[PDB]
Amino acid sequence: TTTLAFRFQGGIIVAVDSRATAGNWVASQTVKKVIEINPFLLGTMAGGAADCQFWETWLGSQCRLHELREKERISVAAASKILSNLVYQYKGAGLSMGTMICGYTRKEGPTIYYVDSDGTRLKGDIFCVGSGQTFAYGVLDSNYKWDLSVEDALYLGKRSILAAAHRDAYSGGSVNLYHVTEDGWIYHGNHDVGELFWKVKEEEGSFNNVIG
Amino acid sequence: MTDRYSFSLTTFSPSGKLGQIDYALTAVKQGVTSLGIKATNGVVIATEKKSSSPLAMSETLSKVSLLTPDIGAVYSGMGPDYRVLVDKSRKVAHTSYKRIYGEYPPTKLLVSEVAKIMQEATQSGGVRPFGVSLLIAGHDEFNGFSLYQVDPSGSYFPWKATAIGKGSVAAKTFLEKRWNDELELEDAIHIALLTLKESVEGEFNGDTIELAIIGDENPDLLGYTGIPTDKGPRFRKLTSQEINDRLEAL
Amino acid sequence: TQQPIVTGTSVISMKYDNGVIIAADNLGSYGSLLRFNGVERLIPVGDNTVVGISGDISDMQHIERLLKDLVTENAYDNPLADAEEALEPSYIFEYLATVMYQRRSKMNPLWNAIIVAGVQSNGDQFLRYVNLLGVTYSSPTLATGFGAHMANPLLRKVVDRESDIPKTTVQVAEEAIVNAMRVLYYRDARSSRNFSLAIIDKNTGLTFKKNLQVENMKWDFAKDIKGYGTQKI
Amino acid sequence: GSRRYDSRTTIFSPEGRLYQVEYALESISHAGTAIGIMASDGIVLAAERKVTSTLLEQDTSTEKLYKLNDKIAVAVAGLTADAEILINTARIHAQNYLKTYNEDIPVEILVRRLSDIKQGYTQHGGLRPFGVSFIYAGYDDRYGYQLYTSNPSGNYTGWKAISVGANTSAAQTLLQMDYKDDMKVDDAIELALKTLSKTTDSSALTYDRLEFATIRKGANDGEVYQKIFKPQEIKDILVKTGIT
Amino acid sequence: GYDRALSIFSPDGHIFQVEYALEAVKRGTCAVGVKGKNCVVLGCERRSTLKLQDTRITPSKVSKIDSHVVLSFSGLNADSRILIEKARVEAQSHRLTLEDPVTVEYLTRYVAGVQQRYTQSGGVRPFGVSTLIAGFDPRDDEPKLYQTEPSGIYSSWSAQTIGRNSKTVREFLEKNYDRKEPPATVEECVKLTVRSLLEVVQTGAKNIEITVVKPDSDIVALSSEEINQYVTQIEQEKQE
Amino acid sequence: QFNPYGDNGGTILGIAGEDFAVLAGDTRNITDYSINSRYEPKVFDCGDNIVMSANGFAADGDALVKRFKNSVKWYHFDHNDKKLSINSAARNIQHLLYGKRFFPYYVHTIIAGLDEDGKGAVYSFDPVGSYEREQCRAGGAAASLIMPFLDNQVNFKNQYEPGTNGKVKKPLKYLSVEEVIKLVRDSFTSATERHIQVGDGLEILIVTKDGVRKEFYELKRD
Amino acid sequence: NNYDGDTVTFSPTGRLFQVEYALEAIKQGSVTVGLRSNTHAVLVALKRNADELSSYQKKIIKCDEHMGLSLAGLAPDARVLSNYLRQQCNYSSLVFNRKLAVERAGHLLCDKAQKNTQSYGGRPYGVGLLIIGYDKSGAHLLEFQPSGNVTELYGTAIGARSQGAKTYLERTLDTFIKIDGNPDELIKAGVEAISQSLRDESLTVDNLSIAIVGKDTPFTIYDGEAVAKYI
Amino acid sequence: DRGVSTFSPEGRLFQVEYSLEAIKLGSTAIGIATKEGVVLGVEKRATSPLLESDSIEKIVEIDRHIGCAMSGLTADARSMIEHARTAAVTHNLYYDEDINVESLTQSVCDLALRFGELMSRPFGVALLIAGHDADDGYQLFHAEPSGTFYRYNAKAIGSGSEGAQAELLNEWHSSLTLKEAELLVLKILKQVMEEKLDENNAQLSCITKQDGFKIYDNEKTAELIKELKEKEAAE
Ligand SMILES: [Mg+2]
């Protein structure tokens, strides 16, 4: 697994791989690791697949109840804390989660919260979670600027997952991109890593170690 | 089923009276006379053994009861209510004191616990007040000899000497004339017997009178020897013969 | 969680053209000690069902009491208790299977393997298995413990699939069952010579045979066997 | 069923009054008068025992004045048995606060807690209220010397001088007349005894019919001392102030 | 537990226990709320039947629920403490979970919900209390003023009064308060609030309390002398 | 120590077509090296044009299917006989599975049917309730033997058009119900040859707008 | 009078007035008919509307594939009792793989209603039910009263003006019991029976509600244009 | 006294019948269902001019496809709305779909008779629940404290209900447009209200398949009031 999310001028980019494994056996290449909590909030899936799926669609239900009662969009701070407080109640029972709760509101602007099954809740600009997280951090750290364009930011997220998919055995399949704006998230397609690798190698001149 | 009486059965009336407590006191007034007198070196408590039938063995009915080795109690009013209070009083002396401090409670604190139980039956759900007034006599190291009265309301007062029940008004007047701060225990027993004779109609002897004292330590009633600090109970119930001996010098 | 103490070994069974047959030996073992020699492990329910039980005997006696209570309960306010609303094999099995799975789910199992054999109202043969884990399955032949490894192979040579059931008579079926019980006596160290056998037929009803013995045993060839290799005397 | 016998102790009258609270206050008006007076250098608590006897053991008796902790004391007016239930609860609350914060409980916090307990009995549970009114005399380092009162409704208020029990109307008028802000403890002692002497239903005010207590910073240097007066000490202060 | 249904319907469709709780509010001392353009003022009556009172320590009529919201009331004093405590706990609970202080409307909705619950729960009687809740939402400069009552209904008010003789001061406010142009300053708002209480109070001495709440957690209680200056200026203009 | 779980073997396969869906599974039930049954049905019609199979530990599998069938029944009672759509059934099964998150149903569940546009649908679940809509999904013992074959022959992975040499992919043309069944049979025949727990028989349930049909085929019994 | 304040009080003549008042709620309810042959069992129910803008209140509830009832009285009480029947039918199927007998279903309803007539605090159910079903002993019709009394019948009717339909069925007894293997004719007899209870109003397309269960017929409810055939 | 769950000699629950009298004292609420949508309208009825009328919330959203209007003791409605919102959201969580309007109404009505000696008394408020689903289209339900709910083509509740219902009897037909329904609610509200109807003392709302549940702005309603006045003066 490799999942990332970062803040920038134009909002938030969310990028994930698609692979799921049971030991060395590749169970699926078409897994959805971005949970669509609602039209304005996104969550990423790492650790336990069920734990992330179940509790983040539950989070969507709680967010919907909030805006019905308060007649106002829930903040990313409040939404992330509902999830972190919930998993903290289960601490010790064996839940497995590592997720980024991503959103863009009026009062906060673009906001990302890393939420963990041992109770951790961190606000930040760049987060990277999974078995291939170290590979993606390398590409992110050396190319990240606040004043990136939406086009260049989308590519940076796509390229960083590709870096992980190449080196990390347990990451790959395809890349799913998302762009989060104040008016909601926008899906930017599914990209097969097999086809993407050769395309990037030729156009970019990278991966000279690999024969193509 | 389930106890569905979770509300108070004793309530304030427009005049500010707690009816059920007043009516409980009325029951005490109908009860047989009992009294208590405090001396310099002891305390005496006494009452009449009003036998319901001559076929009944009145020795099997104890109106004067040991609560602790140094504390005793007598009553006026409803006998059955008294019997269960003695059971509760004996147990609370252990659970809320002896099992904590490794010694028996002082008179005033045991009285305080009995009072609390009687107060709760005046406020708790689905119960009536206890229909008794108690007289509790006792001794302890730091307070010395003492005598307390406890009423249905839970209120308690310390006395030099007093009486409760049927002929209490006349008995208290009799005690006021005779009581002084220089009385020895034998003098107090003598006065107790004189006072009690006035309220008794029929037979007046050791078999119709129940009398106990809180006095000197009785090592003969301890049941074992070998521990110097354990010297025996100060509570002692007088025998039928011991009472009759003092009725000749009456 | 517990361990089985006093235990019963294999229960074996099979279908035939007009009904079902079931059998089990009369032993209650205490480890390697063959302690109790008169234990009945086939328990009839009505005139259309026989429940065969292996494993822990204390738990068997508990199950036996549940089935007894089930018959009593079914008769309450039931004018057709001995007719249309009598207990079916399928009702008895489903009840037991429910209990077995519930008990394993509380981590406190009834340490048994059970085979329910019977005939339904419409004449259909019923034969199904359930164990301490709540696992269930049906087959033309069924067996527990050692029976699964040694009896099934022999019984499957008679009825190999569904279409072999109408071609199998009660005489051929009983013969196969009795032979299997002999083979188990040769080879299972926790088995006995004495056993019980029950037949449930759609025409002739329930026949319960007690105090049967393994007979026609081959032992004579043992006299010629000497040493473990080289020894001649 | 049981509904038939329920008095319904926690309901409003058509006028918006709590029946049982009002009737409990009627009960308290027949109790012995208790007075509290606050001065610059201390607080006085004075109270009248109800028609006593010569055979009552006075030196070991306590029906009016109770110690809650080293800094706070209360004067009682009403059912003594009801008061002791609440007093023990208050003593525990003070110790809970001391264990939690390692500081003595502020006077108002203790008063609010007891008053909230009284309030509960008027709103839920279907039980009769406590027939007790308290005068709280206490000291803490925030507000200094403080006087409060609470009644069966669970309402509490602060005072410079106050009375509860019998003849409060007459007593409050006498206190309102002679009280001044720059008053001292020794002057307050005299005012309290003079007020009881005039309002009492007894023929004369004697030592055996009184309980008395002072809270003074008249303790060696920056600290507070509670003094529950002995029978002989009440007899002396009665002669000193010229009442006997 | 005690489960008796004390609040029930009558043949004419009334819940008398809730209606008798309003009669307790009618008996309570008068309270008034007025919101200006950039502030809200809470005025309260103190009955002068009680002198020899210690005003330092006596419970004040206005209570802070948080640094930005206040609550006043008319009715049973002991009952109001229970609502105030619950409201204060909920305010801190909201900050802890939502990471933002309560809006005035949310805090009102909570207190009103508690009051309603006590009108259809077994073994309990309704609160004999009506409240005025005022303040400013976080990062907002629009004044807020709400009212609640024993039944549990709540609503927003430009200006409102509760308690004894509240019919009279509401009469005053209805003819003196203009919606198109509310009291533009703190002075004008306090003046109109003191004027409204002077219709009912008696003496303008220690009988009137005033509390001013401004945006961004700026809350202050006026002293005797400061209020006395408003009382003086009002009557000198009246002598004409 | 008592082990509440067991392994009953078995292998299942779900494929979604353009206007149909199949859910297949072998009929063999086992423990260790023994055969319990040569014909023990594993794929079930649950009503509302939905077919289901819960492969792994048979006791948990039977419990789950029984509870889902029940959920369909109560959905009709509570919501005016409304048809339970395949997507709604999937979400419901998640809650059934996650309800035992800390003592899981030891099964790999697959359901098949048609979506609300009439197109073929298959959903796949892990033991604790995570689920995906999928085109092709094998489960159980011989899943690792079957899936690579399906990737190659259904999705045409690693297949390119002759003459172009890797430049143009083989186009993803739609398969008929007859074509899918051929691939299912060849999948299980191959799995039977190389996996000891697979054999005896193959039962296929086909789902179309007309309803649910069954097909049975013999497999090797060794 | 003095003995009708609660269900826990007998009158001096041994009557339970709260139960009798609950029985009165059924008489105010709309008419419903039940009848059976040896192969099928039928329910016919006259639905009641609030006004011309309103819908007609549903009267028939399905409990299982082989069982269901019609109601008359407090509709929410019928929902509680029918929900209980659904659960009991379901417990029988899951645990015993057995369809619940109609007679046993009546016994369970009796016992549930009884507990509400002997305890303080509660109240009797204010609804009457007609249960039809087909089990292992053929077709069945039951009548439930909230006193607890359950009765097995060939035919019956409950609700307002139910006496007319009950007399008709008492005359027709020998005819309709013989209607075997003909569902349409059995419903006709039921529609003709409920017609003896109508005044001023007649059976329209959104007024009539019919249900049937039989040998090879699951419990199914007919409403709307599906009952125009029988008008 | 007497039980809370007691039956009268006529076979009615005393407490339920008495709560119906409280609802008669409540402000008027009207609903009209058409094939283009369902309209909901209420009388605000402010007790004083100083009360800011836009804080009077008698029309409420339950979900995007379901709305609700109330009449009677409106404080009692808050827990009913809470339950309805929870039921709607919970069903979406369990089934990944919208809940049927009838099923939502039934869930709300299950609370009604949960009173005894559970809550101490019935609810003193009636609800008009309006919504849309794919199976039964546009719907309007009337939920009472008895636990009974009726579906309606049009319905009025509150103090002016029987006069309004008689008016709805004549005016409703199966071909009404949404615009016609809006004017019809305004017309009937104006007829039964004490004070003169305007955009500040009355409120409109609707539910459509496309846009979902929407409460109308005071500016939008004001235009519809002006449109009503002109068409009544047109003959
Ligand atoms: Mg094989």
Side-chain angles (χ1 to χ4, degrees), chain A residues 13 17 24-26 33 40 46 90 138 147 161 163 167-168 181 189 205:
Chain A
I13 300 302
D17 79 307
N24 301 333
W25 158 246
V26 178
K33 297 186 181 173
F40 302 92
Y90 285 94
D147 291 301
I161 293 293
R167 284 284 184 170
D168 181 28
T181 68

Side-chain angles (χ1 to χ4, degrees), chain B residues 189-197 204 211 243 246-247 250:
Chain B
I189 293 165
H190 175 72
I191 294 162
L193 293 164
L194 282 168
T195 311
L196 199 62
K197 188 183 281 193
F204 192 74
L211 196 150
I243 294 162
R246 288 162 179 78
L247 287 175
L250 207 287

Side-chain angles (χ1 to χ4, degrees), chain H residues 157-168:
Chain H
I157 53 170
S159 57
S161 59
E162 88 272 52
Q165 196 70 16
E167 202 66 36
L168 291 164

Side-chain angles (χ1 to χ4, degrees), chain E residues 12-45:
Chain E
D12 61 336
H14 288 142
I15 307 169
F16 281 131
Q17 281 292 117
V18 176
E19 280 172 11
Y20 300 163
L22 272 168
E23 296 296 319
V25 174
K26 286 179 174 45
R27 178 173 289 94
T29 54
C30 186
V32 59
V34 182
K35 64 199 261 184
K37 203 209 170 195
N38 44 237
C39 69
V40 195
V41 177
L42 295 187
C44 293
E45 184 193 350

